[PDB]
Amino acid sequence: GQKVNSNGLRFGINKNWISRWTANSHAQTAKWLIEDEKIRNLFFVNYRNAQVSNVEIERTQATVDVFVYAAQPAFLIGSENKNIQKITKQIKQIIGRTTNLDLTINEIGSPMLSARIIARDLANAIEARVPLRTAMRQSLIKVLKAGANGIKVLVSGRLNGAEIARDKMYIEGNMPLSTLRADIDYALEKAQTTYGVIGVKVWINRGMIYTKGLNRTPAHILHPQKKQPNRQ
RNA sequence: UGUACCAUUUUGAAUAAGUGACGACUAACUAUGUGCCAGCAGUCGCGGUAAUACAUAGGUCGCAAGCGUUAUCCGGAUUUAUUGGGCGUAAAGCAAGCGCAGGCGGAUUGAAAAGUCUGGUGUUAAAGGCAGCUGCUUAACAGUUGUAUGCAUUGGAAACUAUUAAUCUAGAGUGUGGUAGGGAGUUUUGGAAUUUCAUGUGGAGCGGUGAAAUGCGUAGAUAUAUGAAGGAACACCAGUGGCGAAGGCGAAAACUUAGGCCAUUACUGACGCUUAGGCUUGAAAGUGUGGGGAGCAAAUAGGAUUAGAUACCCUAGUAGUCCACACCGUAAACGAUAGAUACUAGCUGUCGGGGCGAUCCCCUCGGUAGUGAAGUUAACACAUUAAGUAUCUCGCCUGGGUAGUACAUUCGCAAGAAUGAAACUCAAACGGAAUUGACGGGGACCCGCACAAGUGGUGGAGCAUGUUGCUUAAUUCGACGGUACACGAAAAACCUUACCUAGACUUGACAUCCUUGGCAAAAUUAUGGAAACAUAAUGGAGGUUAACCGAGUGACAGGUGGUGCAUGGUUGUCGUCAGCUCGUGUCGUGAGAUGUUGGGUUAAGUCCCGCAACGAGCGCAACCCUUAUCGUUAGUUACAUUGUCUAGCGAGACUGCUAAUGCAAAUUGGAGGAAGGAAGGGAUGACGUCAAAUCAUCAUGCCCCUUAUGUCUAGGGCUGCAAACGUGCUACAAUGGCCAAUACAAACAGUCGCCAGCUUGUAAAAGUGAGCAAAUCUGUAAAGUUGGUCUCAGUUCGGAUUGAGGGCUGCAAUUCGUCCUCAUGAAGUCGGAAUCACUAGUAAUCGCGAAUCAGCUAUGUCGCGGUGAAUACGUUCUCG
RNA sequence: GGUUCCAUGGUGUAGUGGAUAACAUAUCUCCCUGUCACGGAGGGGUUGCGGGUUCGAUUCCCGUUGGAACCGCCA
RNA sequence: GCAUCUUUAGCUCAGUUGGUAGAGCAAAUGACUCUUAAUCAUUGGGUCGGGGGUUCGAGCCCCUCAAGAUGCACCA
RNA sequence: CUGCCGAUAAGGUCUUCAAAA
Ligand SMILES: *C(=O)[C@@H](N)CCCC[NH3+]
Ligand SMILES: [Mg+2]
Ligand SMILES: [Mg+2]
Ligand SMILES: [Mg+2]
Ligand SMILES: [Mg+2]
Ligand SMILES: [Mg+2]
Ligand SMILES: [Mg+2]
Ligand SMILES: [Mg+2]
Ligand SMILES: [Mg+2]
Ligand SMILES: [Mg+2]
Ligand SMILES: [Mg+2]
Numbered sequence A: 001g002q003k004v005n006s007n008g009l010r011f012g013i014n015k016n017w018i019s020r021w022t023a024n025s026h027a028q029t030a031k032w033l034i035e036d037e038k039i040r041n042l043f044f045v046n047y048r049n050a051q052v053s054n055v056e057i058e059r060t061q062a063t064v065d066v067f068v069y070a071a072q073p074a075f076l077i078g079s080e081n082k083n084i085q086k087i088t089k090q091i092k093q094i095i096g097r098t099t100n101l102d103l104t105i106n107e108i109g110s111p112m113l114s115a116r117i118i119a120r121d122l123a124n125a126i127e128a129r130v131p132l133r134t135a136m137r138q139s140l141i142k143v144l145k146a147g148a149n150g151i152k153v154l155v156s157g158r159l160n161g162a163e164i165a166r167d168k169m170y171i172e173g174n175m176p177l178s179t180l181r182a183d184i185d186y187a188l189e190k191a192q193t194t195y196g197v198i199g200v201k202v203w204i205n206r207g208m209i210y211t212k213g214l215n216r217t218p219a220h221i222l223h224p225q226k227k228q229p230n231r232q
Numbered sequence B: 001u002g003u004a005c006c007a008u009u010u011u012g013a014a015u016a017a018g019u020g021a022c023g024a025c026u027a028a029c030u031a032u033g034u035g036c037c038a039g040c041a042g043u044c045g046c047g048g049u050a051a052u053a054c055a056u057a058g059g060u061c062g063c064a065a066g067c068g069u070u071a072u073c074c075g076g077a078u079u080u081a082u083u084g085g086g087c088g089u090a091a092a093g094c095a096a097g098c099g100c101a102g103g104c105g106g107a108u109u110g111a112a113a114a115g116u117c118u119g120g121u122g123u124u125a126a127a128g129g130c131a132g133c134u135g136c137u138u139a140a141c142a143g144u145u146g147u148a149u150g151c152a153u154u155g156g157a158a159a160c161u162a163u164u165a166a167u168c169u170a171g172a173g174u175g176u177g178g179u180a181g182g183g184a185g186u187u188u189u190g191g192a193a194u195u196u197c198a199u200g201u202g203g204a205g206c207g208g209u210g211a212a213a214u215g216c217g218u219a220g221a222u223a224u225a226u227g228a229a230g231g232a233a234c235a236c237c238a239g240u241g242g243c244g245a246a247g248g249c250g251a252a253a254a255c256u257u258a259g260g261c262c263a264u265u266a267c268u269g270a271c272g273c274u275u276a277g278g279c280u281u282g283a284a285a286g287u288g289u290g291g292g293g294a295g296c297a298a299a300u301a302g303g304a305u306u307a308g309a310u311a312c313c314c315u316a317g318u319a320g321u322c323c324a325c326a327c328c329g330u331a332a333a334c335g336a337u338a339g340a341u342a343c344u345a346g347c348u349g350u351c352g353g354g355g356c357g358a359u360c361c362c363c364u365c366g367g368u369a370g371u372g373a374a375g376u377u378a379a380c381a382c383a384u385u386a387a388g389u390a391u392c393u394c395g396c397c398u399g400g401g402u403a404g405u406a407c408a409u410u411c412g413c414a415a416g417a418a419u420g421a422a423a424c425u426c427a428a429a430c431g432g433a434a435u436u437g438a439c440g441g442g443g444a445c446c447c448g449c450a451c452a453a454g455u456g457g458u459g460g461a462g463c464a465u466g467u468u469g470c471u472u473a474a475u476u477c478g479a480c481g482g483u484a485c486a487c488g489a490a491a492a493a494c495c496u497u498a499c500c501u502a503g504a505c506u507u508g509a510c511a512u513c514c515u516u517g518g519c520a521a522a523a524u525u526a527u528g529g530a531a532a533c534a535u536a537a538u539g540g541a542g543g544u545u546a547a548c549c550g551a552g553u554g555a556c557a558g559g560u561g562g563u564g565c566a567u568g569g570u571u572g573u574c575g576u577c578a579g580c581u582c583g584u585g586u587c588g589u590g591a592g593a594u595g596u597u598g599g600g601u602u603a604a605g606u607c608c609c610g611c612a613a614c615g616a617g618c619g620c621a622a623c624c625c626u627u628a629u630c631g632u633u634a635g636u637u638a639c640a641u642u643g644u645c646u647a648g649c650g651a652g653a654c655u656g657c658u659a660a661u662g663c664a665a666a667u668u669g670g671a672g673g674a675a676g677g678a679a680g681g682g683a684u685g686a687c688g689u690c691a692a693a694u695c696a697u698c699a700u701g702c703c704c705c706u707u708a709u710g711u712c713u714a715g716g717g718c719u720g721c722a723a724a725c726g727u728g729c730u731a732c733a734a735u736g737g738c739c740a741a742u743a744c745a746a747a748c749a750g751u752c753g754c755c756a757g758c759u760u761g762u763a764a765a766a767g768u769g770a771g772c773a774a775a776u777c778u779g780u781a782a783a784g785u786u787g788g789u790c791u792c793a794g795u796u797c798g799g800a801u802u803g804a805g806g807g808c809u810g811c812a813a814u815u816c817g818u819c820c821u822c823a824u825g826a827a828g829u830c831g832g833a834a835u836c837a838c839u840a841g842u843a844a845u846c847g848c849g850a851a852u853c854a855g856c857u858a859u860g861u862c863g864c865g866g867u868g869a870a871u872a873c874g875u876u877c878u879c880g
Numbered sequence C: 001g002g003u004u005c006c007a008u009g010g011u012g013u014a015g016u017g018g019a020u021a022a023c024a025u026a027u028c029u030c031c032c033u034g035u036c037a038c039g040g041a042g043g044g045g046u047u048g049c050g051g052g053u054u055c056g057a058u059u060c061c062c063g064u065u066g067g068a069a070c071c072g073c074c075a
Numbered sequence D: 001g002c003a004u005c006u007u008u009a010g011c012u013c014a015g016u017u018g019g020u021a022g023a024g025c026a027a028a029u030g031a032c033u034c035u036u037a038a039u040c041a042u043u044g045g046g047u048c049g050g051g052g053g054u055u056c057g058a059g060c061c062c063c064u065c066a067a068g069a070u071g072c073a074c075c076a
Numbered sequence E: 001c002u003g004c005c006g007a008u009a010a011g012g013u014c015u016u017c018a019a020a021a
């Protein structure tokens, strides 16, 4: 049957919001809401070879702050800070010159156990004509070796160019979806294949959060260092 | 025959490549076209608008001066099985027996030598066959030498078979001695019971069924008691049994008669097994002649049931069922297993003879059963009574339908029996066994407003809204049992809008990429205008082009156009039901089984035990939110009748204690407690099913349009109307209508808004106008209490419809907004067959608020509080 | 050629001694079921043509059509 | 022979008794479905057998032909 | 505790593949 979004079921209890701002009026609540979606989509659609895991947005009456986590930030940084200037101009055109931006790339730790880049890698493999069975298994084994709990991958679509759509799942371990205390990270991606669209869904279990609180604490960014800059 | 061949003879790549296939068997794939059409096919099968199977093209593969197709023969085919198959459940053991000819057949001795083996000789024509060699440029081919097979004759071998001459008893029979039987035929005899009749008593039904009705009965039935007549069959005994070759045999007796078991110091001395043809017997039905006929009952008549009933039920009812003599010769005639012979673990019964002598029990020899290993089988299963290891003999089988049909023949009075095909057609078969599911008008157990017990409704009337159908220029599109129909749509006058009629536009209303400049787009005022749009004006923020304003410019933009049966995403449903699987191991040739099923306990695959299973994952449960009590922090904009109230943290409830019984989980009761055994509610919805819903939220493969299916605007339309259905509102009333006074909420919302008060107005509202960015100000609570009146009427019920006058929003209210006032006063007096929801603050009912919104007969949707019930005995029926 | 009968709903048939027309099937709407048949409720639909009598004709009278049933013989 | 009737889209038949034609099938088109069947809507399709005559006007009334079928004589 | 209880148009998907990591 149908299931409630795993990310959406855990918001406001154990998971913080990706955008944290309070608008002035119901007219300014819509502009500030579509614009941040454009920024997030920009980061995700293009600049994909970087493995951007999550982009957070922080806005005040007039000051915009962006916290961008990536696995390989060299591509964003570019050759002696070139590509970086380009993206700043991109961000300024979307929000406006009248405001103040404080974009912040922040390098990420433990990149494997994140459902976003795994789905992106999965989608790239399917688009690259890689056999589906082999592609998921290599991603599954590497993620488990990274030192996490069970992972559930559902890859539904016109499998292998077939005319009848199927779906292949591969769970390997305890994925307690009905439990609220668990840390389940979820992401979904659309692999654009020449024979249509492939939907990949990745459920990852990253332990149990036994410390009550609406997070305010990082998630799989702590193990190695996490810095770099571009801020003020 | 100037032929093969030869040569440094001239010229010169010049004179020369096709066919089949490409989904699998079977080496070799893509596009275009078509769209269950045209076509392909040796087999499985491809084609229903994304075809590697069709057509064309490109590529590739298999062959080659050949390649495919067709025809015929052999192999593969162990698929007529001598080598080399089978007959319990798949085709196939005759219904059984007596059996001649045929086949086979105990042991020992002698002879012969017909089979059998071997030596010599003759022959089995030449070509061909196989081996070697030679010759053609090697080969194909030609020649060359070698190379068997059988028959006859002759000379030996004597193990086995056959023949002959004899001996023996162990095979098989005979006799004596024990002995068990529903074995058969013929002739007599007996008692219950039914029916009819005769005689009494008696007095209204009997009979029959799911329920009844034909029928019988005051002419005295049913019933009761006695008697007589007659026919058929032989309760109990009677069986985890007996006899016979089979069919079959069960009251008692007599006569005749068949076979069998056990022990044999007796006798014959292979006389034995099987059996084509032949003969005998052979359930029931049926036939012919003559008797008999109580009961029952094919055919038949009537009454029921039924859409129909020539059937199941009931009441009658002939042939027949019975006997004697003649036929018929078929059955699931079954142990679905032909007969005979020898061998191969065991255990438990039961019957008969014999040995012992109370039975009972022990042993021996046989008959009849159950369980069971090796062994066999495709599996089920058989297993000393074989379907096991083997031999002999007979019968029978060779895919399914045609078909046990047709012709011919034999038998029969007759129906028919025996024997028994083919033409044609299919790729399989009402094939066999077993496995996983589904289903059952099959069982066992357990659940849910399912039934049951109640309450209030719906189907009847008026109105609102959605749908079907019809119409129209359009009535845009989708949803269509449960799981569509107050659904998408949380707002159709314009806009929305996707539709129709018209007036206008073409790299376009919007976008990027490119050569190139920016010294604008807006908005608004004029004129023509239905408005789109044009011609003229202030020429405009800014920042030198940032963004945009453009020119030039072709790739293109654009599509609510098709396909939810190509999809991604999201959702309904079973269902918040308790399920769905995996790893390792074990069993099974295999699909598969195990765990996951057994016993207890739950809402639960929840847990505990048992257990060839041991564990694990998803679901279940808990962690999350909210309501119920209290502690702590805080005290304004709450409270201020002083500790409410509001929201942060925490305590509290954990089967924690006790009693009962259970191994243990756990169930029930009690204690204390605000709360007791998921304390109430919410979020949370496994694998999957229905090719379930959506291309019209969005995204997207493919197809289609490209001065039009794209774009702008005005008007119309989505609001129609002979009709039908669904969901709601209002009612049909005194538990009420109207009027007056009046008490008690929670939640939510608010600066183009909430709007207090005041003034005007019969009122919707207008003007003035504070207060409130909000625990402060505003959004009148109604049912309810009291008083007056109506007095049961189509009314002081009910409000539809209609006419007029007003108010608000908005350019604009006619198509098509709602509110108020006045006027009128349809139907309707509790609603047919049949249906829906609900297990406590629930049903019922009364108001209040919010979302989308300028406004909206939203009576809709999402929320909040006021009052506040009835019933649950139980699973027989009903749905899942 | 002559004589008797009949003409009623969409189909098969009753009635009316002048004042009045029903039955069954069929048809329609609604329960019913996954659906349909069957079942349940309710709804609907009629005198061959003509011409006279009567206040009034399906009925009574005379003619005209169509369909049937009887006869048409003696030489 | 005679008297009588009939000839009507592709087929089977009503037309009405004079103002010039439909019904039911078949075909097609859509709708409808995965696609069909079925269903449903819609729909094109006529020398009223050939000529003559009457009439202002003939599928309609009267004649002659062409092709069939009826009832009356293969002399009672 | 034996009422009654009938039917359901045709053809169709779906396993691509282990060479292996
Ligand atoms: C019999 O029928 C006769 N009267 C008829 C003779 C006819 C001759 N033309
Ligand atoms: Mg071909
Ligand atoms: Mg082809
Ligand atoms: Mg062969
Ligand atoms: Mg052979
Ligand atoms: Mg065989
Ligand atoms: Mg057989
Ligand atoms: Mg036998
Ligand atoms: Mg037999
Ligand atoms: Mg014998
Ligand atoms: Mg003999």
Ligand SMILES: [Mg+2]
Binding pocket: none
């Ligand atoms: Mg020779």
Ligand SMILES: [Mg+2]
Binding pocket: B142
């Ligand atoms: Mg030769």
Ligand SMILES: [Mg+2]
Binding pocket: B227
């Ligand atoms: Mg007697």
Ligand SMILES: [Mg+2]
Binding pocket: B284
């Ligand atoms: Mg008999």
Ligand SMILES: [Mg+2]
Binding pocket: none
């Ligand atoms: Mg009868």
Ligand SMILES: [Mg+2]
Binding pocket: none
């Ligand atoms: Mg009887």
Ligand SMILES: [Mg+2]
Binding pocket: B319, B320
């Ligand atoms: Mg008889």
Ligand SMILES: [Mg+2]
Binding pocket: none
């Ligand atoms: Mg037989």
Ligand SMILES: [Mg+2]
Binding pocket: none
């Ligand atoms: Mg056995």
Ligand SMILES: [Mg+2]
Binding pocket: none
């Ligand atoms: Mg045959």
Ligand SMILES: [Mg+2]
Binding pocket: none
């Ligand atoms: Mg035979």
Ligand SMILES: [Mg+2]
Binding pocket: none
């Ligand atoms: Mg058959």
Ligand SMILES: [Mg+2]
Binding pocket: none
């Ligand atoms: Mg089965």
Ligand SMILES: [Mg+2]
Binding pocket: B452
């Ligand atoms: Mg009830």
Ligand SMILES: [Mg+2]
Binding pocket: none
């Ligand atoms: Mg109603």
Ligand SMILES: [Mg+2]
Binding pocket: none
């Ligand atoms: Mg009605």
